[PDB]
């Protein structure tokens, strides 16, 4: 899709910040473009928190009629959990924050490096996979 290619060229994750929702401590922060089709040094403290507040600030060069996202968690190729978000209208060449949630989980030792977060930014704009190193 031409629109998908234009969005991928124009879109860029400025900075992401994953933090405990019960406290707000910045468990992990980064500036890599997670939307591009990597590895994330997220600590194991995510396993020890009830939920995570997730703040993906993204700059988009093209407007999205309904900007939304799908998230999946895979443990050694086996789907562990799935998430879905929705921000909505986005103007071209605009930078916008994305405040949302990430809610039995396996021990960090088992999931250390064996966790894949598949993030699909949507029409489908891009897909990517991030290897989590607890």
């Amino acid at each position: 899709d031409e629109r998908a290619r234009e969005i991928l060229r124009g879109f860029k994750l400025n900075w992401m910040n994953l933090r405990d929702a019960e406290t707000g401590k910045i468990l992990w922060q980064g500036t890599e473009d997670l939307s591009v089709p990597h590895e994330a040094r997220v600590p194991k403290k995510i396993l020890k928190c009830k939920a995570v507040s997730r703040e993906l600030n993204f700059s988009s060069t093209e407007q999205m009629e309904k900007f939304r996202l799908e998230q999946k968690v895979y443990f050694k190729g086996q789907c562990l959990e799935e998430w879905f978000f929705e921000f909505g209208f986005v103007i071209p060449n605009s930078t916008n924050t994305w405040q949302s949630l990430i809610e039995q989980m396996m021990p960090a030792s088992v999931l250390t490096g064996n966790v894949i977060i598949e993030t699909k930014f949507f029409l489908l704009v891009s897909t990517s996979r991030v290897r989590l190193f607890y």
């Binding site: 929702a21 019960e22 707000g24 401590k25 978000f85 909505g88 949302s100 949630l101």
Partner: protein, 343 residues
């Protein structure tokens, strides 16, 4: 300022602002799942309910309003004093500002979001302790001019309880069991570190006290104002300092101060749902700080928050609040969670 945090401007200025129940009349009342804190009648509880079941529950309640909060032995019925609903992010967030109105004991726990069957505990108000042995002649002497310290209360004893020579007990005993003397004593010990009604004040200062969950449900179990006030005075005399629950001395009692009309502590809502019974205080030690000062969703307008965890076991137990402007009175303070503090 002193009146900034009470309205919860962080929950949004616009809100649908708007329920006495029969005494001892059992009611089937909704119970929300997100409330783990022990509420008191009169303590304000704000709320952020974004779960679909919770949102439907709030819509059903306000389509009528009163809901309930558990601790699950006893609990409190609170009426909703402010409503807001937002459809942002595709989630029908519902932001509420209720206040505890009445009390109850738990009889049953139904499930649908609970609809627990609960019996309302009546406000067991007692009359004046001297209303019994009051002499018909001396009844005219039991009203006093407006209070203009020690001499005034000596006159209060020597006049109000002059009929305590009829009974088999001293004046100061009835002063211990007097409502107004307990009012004065708790006020003195609070200003060392409010409504005129003994019941409302008793619930207010029950909210004020930084006490255990067990002690707070104990106070809820109390029916009469005088028993409660006596228990709170005993607790305040007993309480000395606050330590982290995981450590088992972040903060001392005397350092406590009140930045809100609700008291030194109040229930405040995390920006994404959770509730903390945060206690304001002017001094807190052994707290490592994480995060730059941010005004995003600050509970106290004109202040910037910053996470505070005890450096011993790194457990979050509060936040540091720094004024955005130097003119703010005070310049900075701390807010500590009751859930993580062990008196």
């Amino acid at each position: 300022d002193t009146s900034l945090p009470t309205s919860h401007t962080y929950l949004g200025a616009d809100m649908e602002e708007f329920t006495l129940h029969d005494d001892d009349s059992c009611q089937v009342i909704p119970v929300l799942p997100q409330v783990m804190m022990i509420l008191i009648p009169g303590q304000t509880l704000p709320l952020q309910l974004f779960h679909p079941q919770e949102v439907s529950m709030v819509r059903n309640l306000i389509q009528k309003r009163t809901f309930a909060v558990l601790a699950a032995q006893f609990g409190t019925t609170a009426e909703i004093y402010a409503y807001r609903e937002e459809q942002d992010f595709g989630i029908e967030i519902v932001k509420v500002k209720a206040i505890g109105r009445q009390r109850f004991k738990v009889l049953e726990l139904r499930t649908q979001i609970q609809q627990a069957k609960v019996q309302i505990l009546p406000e067991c108000v007692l009359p004046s302790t001297m209303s019994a042995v009051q002499l018909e002649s001396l009844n005219k002497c039991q009203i006093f001019p407006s209070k203009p310290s020690y001499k005034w209360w000596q006159k209060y004893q020597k006049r109000k309880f002059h009929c305590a020579n009829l009974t088999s007990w001293p004046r100061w005993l009835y002063s211990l069991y007097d409502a107004e003397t307990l009012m004065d004593r708790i006020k003195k010990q609070l200003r060392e570190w409010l409504p005129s009604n003994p019941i409302d004040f008793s619930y207010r200062v029950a909210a004020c006290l930084p006490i255990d969950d067990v002690l707070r449900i104990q106070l809820l179990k109390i029916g009469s104002a005088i028993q409660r006030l006596r228990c709170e005075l005993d607790i305040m005399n007993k309480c000395t300092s606050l330590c982290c629950k995981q450590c088992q001395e972040i903060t001392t009692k005397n350092e406590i101060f009140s930045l809100s009309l609700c008291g030194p502590m109040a229930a405040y809502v995390n920006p994404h749902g959770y509730v903390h019974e945060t206690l304001t205080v002017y001094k807190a030690c052994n707290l490592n700080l994480i995060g730059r000062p941010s005004t995003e969703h600050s509970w106290f307008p004109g202040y910037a928050w910053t996470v505070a965890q005890c450096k011993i076991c790194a457990s979050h137990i509060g936040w540091k609040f720094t004024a955005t402007k130097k003119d703010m009175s005070p310049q900075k303070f701390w807010g500590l969670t009751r859930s993580a503090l062990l008196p």
